[PDB]
C-alpha cells in the first residue's frame, strides 16, 4: 500500500531535505543551514555561498567528448568541461542517447557535472576522454617549454608528455601515468602544422589508440595527414604500433578528426565491423550438460556492406541422424552442419566430454545489422542458441558528434540536423539580479531571461489540418520531415508529433551553417499514414539570402520567377500538407528547464526555497 500510494500520491513522501539525485551544492547548503539558530543573515549568507557554487558550475564550458558506442544514436556520451579559472579545473558529465526518443534529450538523460580531483595543465586543449573496459580514462598532453632567449649558449628545450588517468569506483581519480611523447610531437612540430589528437578504444584488440595528426581543413582518404601514433595496453606499458597499422587505423577514422574549424567527438574504434557474441553457452540438462560453443571467430569485409565470417563451432557434451549445427539469418539458414557428415575426429565414448569440432565455417553476408543465430540442434528437443550480432560502423558524417561554440558564448552539440545546448549563460545575467537582492534572483523574470538560438538557424511555425481519417490515413500522426541538408538530399525524419483535433501548431528551429542546403534549400514536408507530401514543391522550401542576411520562405504564393539560393527558378508552387508556414523572426526560448543544465535550475528555483 505504501508503494501504490507513492505511485498515486508522490506528494505524501517528498521531503524538501533529502532527494535521490541532489547535487553536492544542495548538500552543502543543507550542511551550512543545519543549525538550531537560523537568522535572516545566516540564511542569506548560506544562499550567497550557494550562488557562488551555482555560478561556478554555471560557467562551465565543454572542450571535448567521447561517444561510447559505434552508432551515435545508441550509446552514451562523456563530455569534459572546464571552469573560468587560471588554475583551470576540469569536470566530466554523462548524457544518454537511449533516452532521446526522437532527436531531443530529456533531462533524465543528462548526468551531473563531476569535479575531477586530479590537477591538469593541458597544452592547447588536447584533452580527450576515452571509455576503456567500461572505465573512464582521461588523456591529455602537457608541455615543458624552457627557453634561454640568448645568443651565448641559446637553449630551447620542449618536453611533450602524455598523461593518463582513470576514475575509481569511489569517485577518486588515479595518479596520472606519464608517457614521454616528445619525439612524435616534435616530428609533427618540425613540419609546419597544428596538432590534433585522436583518442579512442579498440575493443577487438584490447588496447586504446592515441595518434597525433596535423590539422588540415579536410581529410581526403588519398592524402592522409602527417601522423605519428601509439597505443597503450590495459597494463599501462606502451605498445609500439607500426606504420601499416597506423595507416589503416587513420583511414578507419578520418571522419572523426578535429579539423581547423570544427571540433569532433571520437566514437568507439571499429575498422569495419564488431561482432557481439559469446563463446561458450551451456544448458545443464538433468542428463548431461551439452555446452556448445564457438571458438575462433574472425571476419573480413571485402567491400562496402559485405562480410566473410570464419569460425569453428563445436559442442562439448559431458555426462548421427542426431545432433547438428545450424546457423540462421532472420529466416535464411546460411550454413547447416551434421555430426555424421563432414566431421573429422568423431569422439569416442571413453571420453566423458564429447567434442565434435564440425569444420571451418565460411559464409558471405551483406548488410549493416546482421543478427545471426547459431544453433546446436540435439533433438531426438534441445536447441542451444548462440546469437552473433554483427554491426557495421557507418563512416558517414551523420555518425559523428560535432560540438560548436558561438561567439555569443553559447555552446552546442550537433548530431546531424539536431542541435543540443551544452552551456548556459545565466551566470552572465545573475550578478545584476543578485547584488540587488535575494528576492530578485528568485523572480519569474529571472526565469524568463532569453538565451541565444544555438547557431545561425531560424524558426518556423507549422500549422496543421485536423484529423478526419482521409488525407491523413489511420494512425493519427504527422512526421514533419526535412530534406536538402547534406549531400544526402532525401526525406530525413526531423520531427514527429501526434495529430490532433481542429488546430495544432509547432514551431521548429531549422539549422544553417553555410555548407548545408544543397539544392533549392531545406524543404520541410509533412508525413502521414496516408500518402506523404513533398512531390515537386509540395514541401516547405527555405533558403538563406546572403545579401539581406536573412532567411526567405520560397513557397508562400504561387510565385513565378522567384529567387532561390541557386538562382531564379520559373514556377514555384505553394507548400502542401500544412496551412501556414512563416519564419518566426527572433524567437526567445527562455531557459529550458528540460535541458542539459535542468537539474541546476530546478535546484535553484524550486528545491533551494523548499
Amino acid at each position: 500500500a505504501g508503494v501504490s500510494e507513492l505511485a498515486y500520491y508522490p506528494e505524501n513522501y517528498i521531503d524538501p531535505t533529502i532527494r535521490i539525485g541532489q547535487t553536492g551544492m544542495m548538500n552543502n547548503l543543507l550542511q551550512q543551514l543545519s543549525q538550531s539558530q537560523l537568522n535572516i543573515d545566516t540564511v542569506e549568507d548560506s544562499f550567497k555561498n550557494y550562488l557562488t557554487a551555482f555560478e561556478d558550475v554555471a560557467n562551465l564550458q565543454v572542450i571535448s567528448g567521447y561517444h561510447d558506442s559505434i552508432n551515435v544514436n545508441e550509446g552514451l556520451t562523456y563530455l569534459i568541461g572546464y571552469s573560468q579559472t587560471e588554475p583551470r579545473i576540469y569536470y566530466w558529465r554523462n548524457v544518454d542517447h537511449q533516452k532521446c526518443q526522437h532527436g531531443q534529450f530529456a533531462a533524465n538523460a543528462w548526468g551531473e557535472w563531476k569535479k575531477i580531483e586530479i590537477p591538469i595543465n593541458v597544452w592547447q586543449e588536447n584533452i580527450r576522454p576515452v571509455i576503456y573496459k567500461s572505465r573512464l580514462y582521461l588523456l591529455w598532453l602537457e608541455q615543458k617549454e624552457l627557453k634561454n632567449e640568448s645568443e651565448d649558449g641559446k637553449i630551447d628545450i620542449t618536453d611533450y608528455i602524455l598523461k593518463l588517468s582513470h576514475i575509481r569506483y569511489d569517485g577518486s581519480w588515479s595518479s596520472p601515468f606519464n608517457f614521454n611523447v616528445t619525439d612524435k610531437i616534435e616530428n609533427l612540430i618540425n613540419k609546419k602544422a597544428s596538432i590534433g589528437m585522436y583518442c579512442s578504444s579498440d575493443y577487438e584488440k584490447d588496447v586504446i589508440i592515441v595518434y597525433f595528426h596535423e590539422k588540415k581543413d579536410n581529410y581526403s582518404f588519398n592524402s592522409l595527414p602527417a601522423r605519428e601514433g601509439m597505443t597503450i595496453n590495459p597494463d599501462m606499458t606502451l605498445s609500439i604500433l607500426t606504420e601499416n597499422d597506423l595507416d589503416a587505423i587513420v583511414k578507419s577514422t578520418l571522419s572523426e578528426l578535429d579539423t581547423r574549424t570544427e571540433y569532433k567527438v571520437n566514437n568507439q574504434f571499429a575498422t569495419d565491423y564488431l561482432a557481439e557474441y559469446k563463446e561458450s553457452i551451456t544448458t545443464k540438462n538433468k542428463l548431461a550438460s551439452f555446452t556448445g560453443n564457438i571458438f575462433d571467430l574472425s571476419y573480413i569485409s571485402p567491400g562496402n556492406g559485405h562480410i566473410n565470417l570464419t569460425f569453428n563451432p563445436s559442442m562439448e557434451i559431458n555426462f548421427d541422424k542426431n545432433i547438428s549445427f545450424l546457423l540462421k539469418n532472420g529466416s535464411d539458414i546460411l550454413v547447416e552442419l551434421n555430426a555424421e557428415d563432414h566431421v573429422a575426429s568423431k569422439p569416442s565414448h571413453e571420453s566423458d566430454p564429447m567434442v565434435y569440432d564440425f569444420n571451418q565455417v565460411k559464409v558471405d553476408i551483406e548488410g549493416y545489422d546482421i543478427p545471426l543465430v547459431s544453433e546446436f540442434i540435439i533433438k531426438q528437443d534441445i536447441v542451444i542458441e548462440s546469437p552473433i550480432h554483427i554491426k557495421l560502423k557507418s563512416k558517414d558524417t551523420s555518425n559523428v558528434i560535432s560540438l560548436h561554440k558561438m561567439p555569443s558564448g553559447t555552446q552546442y552539440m550537433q548530431i546531424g540536423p539536431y542541435r543540443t545546448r551544452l552551456n548556459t549563460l545565466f551566470s552572465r545575467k545573475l550578478a545584476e539580479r543578485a547584488n540587488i537582492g535575494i528576492d530578485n534572483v528568485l523572480s519569474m523574470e529571472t526565469q524568463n531571461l532569453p538565451e541565444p538560438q544555438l547557431g545561425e538557424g531560424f524558426y518556423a511555425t507549422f500549422k496543421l489540418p485536423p484529423y478526419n481519417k482521409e488525407e491523413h490515413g489511420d494512425e493519427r500522426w504527422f512526421k514533419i520531415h526535412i530534406g536538402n541538408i547534406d549531400g544526402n538530399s532525401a526525406r530525413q525524419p526531423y520531427y514527429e508529433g501526434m495529430l490532433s483535433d481542429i488546430e495544432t501548431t509547432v514551431t521548429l528551429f531549422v539549422p544553417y551553417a553555410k555548407g548545408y542546403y544543397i539544392r533549392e534549400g531545406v524543404r520541410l514536408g509533412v508525413g502521414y499514414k496516408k500518402i506523404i507530401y513533398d512531390k515537386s514543391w509540395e514541401s516547405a522550401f527555405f533558403y538563406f539570402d546572403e545579401t539581406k542576411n536573412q532567411f526567405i520562405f520560397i513557397n508562400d504564393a504561387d510565385h513565378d520567377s522567384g529567387m532561390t539560393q541557386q538562382g531564379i527558378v520559373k514556377n514555384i508552387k505553394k507548400y502542401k500538407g500544412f496551412i501556414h508556414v512563416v519564419v518566426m523572426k527572433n524567437n526567445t526560448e527562455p531557459m529550458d528547464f528540460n535541458g542539459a543544465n535542468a537539474i541546476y535550475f530546478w535546484e535553484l528555483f524550486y528545491y533551494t526555497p523548499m
Binding site: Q32, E86, P87, P119, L146, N148
Partner: protein
C-alpha cells in the same frame, strides 16, 4: 564562520600552484619550477576540505546536544508542573480532613 572560511583558501592554494609552475631561474641556467605544485595544492585542498567537514560535523553535533538539552528541560518542567498540581490537590484533601 570557521567551516565557511576554511574552504575559501583552496582556490588560493591553486593560485599559488599555478604561479609556481613558471620557471624562476633565467640565463645560463634555463629554469627551475616545481612540477608537483598543482598536486601539492590539490592535496592540501582536499585536506582543508576534510577539516571543514569535520568542523561542520562538530557544529551540527553541538546544535543537537543543545536541542536534547532543551528536551530534557521540557521533561523536568512537566514533572514540576505535575508535582505542583499534585501538592495542590493534597492541600485540598487536607482541607477536607
Amino acid at each position: 564562520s570557521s567551516s565557511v572560511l576554511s574552504t575559501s583558501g583552496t582556490a588560493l592554494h591553486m593560485a599559488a600552484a599555478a604561479a609556481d609552475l613558471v620557471p624562476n631561474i633565467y640565463g645560463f641556467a634555463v629554469g627551475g619550477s616545481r612540477f608537483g605544485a598543482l598536486f601539492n595544492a590539490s592535496a592540501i585542498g582536499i585536506e582543508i576540505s576534510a577539516s571543514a567537514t569535520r568542523i561542520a560535523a562538530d557544529k551540527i553535533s553541538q546544535s543537537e546536544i543543545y536541542r536534547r538539552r532543551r528536551q530534557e528541560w521540557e521533561i523536568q518542567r512537566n514533572n514540576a508542573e505535575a508535582e505542583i498540581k499534585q501538592i495542590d490537590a493534597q492541600l485540598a484533601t487536607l482541607a477536607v480532613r
